[PDB]
Ligand binder design. Structure first.
Ligand SMILES: *Cc1c(COP(=O)(O)O)cnc(C)c1O
Ligand SMILES: *Cc1c(COP(=O)(O)O)cnc(C)c1O
Ligand SMILES: NCc1nc2ccccc2s1
Lengths: 425, 427
């Protein structure tokens, strides 16, 4: 198919994310390193993938180590059913994940998507308390501003009013919501969180939050000390603590996992997105040995979940390579350099008339605007400057590949600033 | 690098397996070290042995493992574009696959929403159904109806329409959505069943967004078959009472039942359809939800607006590329004759099990063969028996069954069925 034919087929037959049908996408034809080749007005152009393809492509596209890991595994074994069989890619990846995640997370359940890994975490929490003979502990608690995926359970802990799933609240499980967690640390907030949790403790299976950075809900940051408070509160009231690190994992916030900013270990943890270096869909839910054993010794005797492509050897093999590539370099210095480049590059946006905030956390850079960003203006403005940016809500933001040179980061931040300037034009 | 012993050690300490425990699995998993064609290489007592993948790795591996055409499609795409976000961008693999799927699926399904697994595609189908009726100003139409014996995945909405026994709905009391269940659809066609289904649906019609069923073959819920004519009845009932019809063809798709899609046995088109498992030829996780023009434009014209779903790895170029190759490989051969031959081989091979003491039924539909026994099948006994005969079988409950790769030779089908018959004999 030509780009023209792709556009025609796409218009007729393809549903895009968070969209309606019939009420235009840009053709992508190649991706290498930090760069995409897109078709604009019939001609190929090279643009920086400032979004890392929705936060996945941390080593960029077509990395030789990841490519070879995939082709090596493809030669041996593409996939076998994980029911009754095991294999080396799953074992290598599970061993890696247990060793690099917060202390105490000793078991690994692979699934094929982030939303599913969140449902698995919830199922773990619910089955845990059923195993303890306390089936009334079945509700979830979170704070506002959150996002945890698009399946119906995950939707139930999305922000009820400003969240993308707000229109569904009347058919979702009704969960417990604390107010928006502030950026700066305020002990009054933690005290109020505890007071609210206290009156629901007997019906709460778990607290579920995104640690440090809330992503799709508004790119909001909060002080890591809140996580210390959450761990304490959950410990004292016997509520499981679940961290959704599907966006924050694998170095993105400047720590390997955002939980590490607070030295906190949850009872259950979800990871995904950057897990495979953006090659293939894979996610994982980890839990402590205590949780696993309590589920396993329960009247159920088994965690009742088992995706068809569970622990897919191809996805596991590229994930192993991606994690090893990350760990085998000085990733912390790399991220610190990125963060410094984002900070320096976005500083001039603070003075722009339409800009209300500029904030950076590791390899996350955000310009918050005073109005929703119009993609019809933003997209060509960024493409004109050789950068693929995808704003949402009132945010112009970047989550660049870790392989971006300082010059490339400067190019990215320059485009972001010019998009923000156009917002107030 | 890891030896098989080190793999077992890591696995026992750190890996969850499907529907299992940590620490008290009666049987340790077996180490798989290679797969090629219809054959797996497994480690038995330290020795690598080649055994037939009689299960097609849970319905997925219809062209066998490491098929050259599929390997090639994957590596070709890998060299140009591994993955880009589907938010704001599109690409040739997505377009090629979408075009293929709309052309070969039942008439009227012309829009495709890609996702990353079967369970998610079922959730997307339910969301479509619910949002559809919201778009018609009937938000009370929010429940689902199905018949017993079904399986539709493991996420919480998918669980709510799984058979209340199979999905152990006593453990999840009040947790799951309360859906409407009709009785187990029988194997043989009985118009009384359909009339009863209709009467039950009628009393719930103002509450119901959709009927969701597996057409012709109910897989994980019990490998049960039913007459295609029931689907004709469902289509009619749904039309007259204004309830959408959703077919979950995640297990039945791409030729498995002897038709390209099981719906084709009845010549009916659902409003929404889910596909998966064999979509990628068993290389990578991919699924899709298709709907009619009416469904898509009613959702899109609703005040609610956009369908708020968007998997991060939606329409992944690698998975789409291999799927295109898998579908073209299927369509480029006389697949109908291939399946008919497989069915003949299964029927011939399983015939002798019918007289076995423990066996209550033997049934075959396309490339699916089932021996139903009168008691649960012991894995600790059945697995070495099968392996001794060069076959990887995975019984569940009282069922010894197989869904072999379409590339299996007559000799391989003879080997598989003989292994099944022997497992039944040992029961
Ligand atoms: C296997 C299956 C599913 C779920 O697919 P996963 O990829 O395991 O989530 C759903 N419906 C049917 C009919 C299936 O056979
Ligand atoms: C991306 C993401 C998920 C899962 O989304 P998918 O669309 O299923 O990949 C869940 N939680 C958070 C915090 C995420 O960023
Ligand atoms: N479901 C995966 C994602 N969903 C979103 C939503 C808004 C911004 C980024 C993302 S990534």
């Amino acid at each position: 198919l030509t780009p023209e034919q792709i556009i025609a087929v796409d218009g007729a037959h393809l549903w895009h994310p968070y969209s309606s049908i019939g009420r235009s996408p840009v053709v992508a034809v190649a991706a290498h390193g930090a760069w995409l080749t897109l078709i604009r007005d019939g001609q190929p152009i090279e643009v920086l993938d400032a979004m890392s393809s929705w936060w996945t492509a941390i080593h960029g596209h077509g990395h030789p180590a990841l490519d070879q890991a995939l082709t090596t595994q493809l030669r041996v074994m593409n996939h076998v059913m994980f029911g009754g069989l095991t294999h080396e890619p799953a074992a290598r990846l599970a061993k890696l994940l247990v060793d690099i995640t917060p202390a105490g997370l000793d078991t690994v359940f692979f699934s094929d998507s982030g939303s599913v890994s969140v449902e698995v975490a919830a199922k773990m929490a619910l089955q845990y308390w059923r195993g303890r003979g306390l089936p009334g502990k079945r509700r979830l608690m979170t704070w506002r501003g959150g996002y945890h995926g698009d399946t119906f359970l995950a939707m139930s802990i999305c922000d009820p009013h400003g969240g993308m799933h707000s229109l569904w609240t009347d058919v979702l499980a009704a969960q417990v919501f604390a107010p928006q967690v502030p950026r700066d640390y305020d002990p009054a907030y933690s005290a109020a969180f505890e007071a609210q949790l206290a009156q629901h403790a007997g019906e709460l299976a778990a607290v579920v939050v995104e640690p440090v950075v809330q992503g799709a809900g508004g790119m909001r940051f909060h002080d890591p000390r809140y996580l210390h408070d959450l761990r304490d509160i959950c410990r004292r009231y016997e509520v499981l603590l679940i961290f959704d690190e599907i966006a924050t994992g694998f170095g993105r916030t400047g720590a390997l996992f955002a939980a590490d900013h607070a030295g906190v270990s949850p009872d259950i943890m979800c990871v995904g997105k950057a897990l495979t270096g953006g090659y293939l869909s894979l996610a994982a839910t980890l839990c402590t040995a205590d949780v696993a054993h309590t589920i396993s010794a329960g009247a159920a005797g088994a965690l009742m979940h088992g995706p068809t492509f569970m622990a897919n050897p191809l996805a596991c093999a590229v994930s192993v390579a991606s994690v090893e590539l990350l760990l085998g370099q000085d990733w912390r210095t790399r991220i610190t350099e990125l963060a410094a480049g984002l900070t320096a590059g976005l500083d001039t946006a603070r003075a722009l008339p339409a800009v209300t905030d500029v904030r950076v956390c590791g390899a996350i850079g955000v310009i918050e605007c005073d109005r929703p960003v119009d993609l019809a203006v933003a997209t060509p403005a960024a493409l004109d400057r050789g950068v693929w940016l995808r704003p949402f809500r009132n945010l112009v933001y970047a989550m660049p590949p870790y392989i971006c040179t300082p010059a490339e980061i400067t190019q990215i931040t320059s485009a972001m600033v010019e998009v923000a300037r156009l917002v107030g034009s």
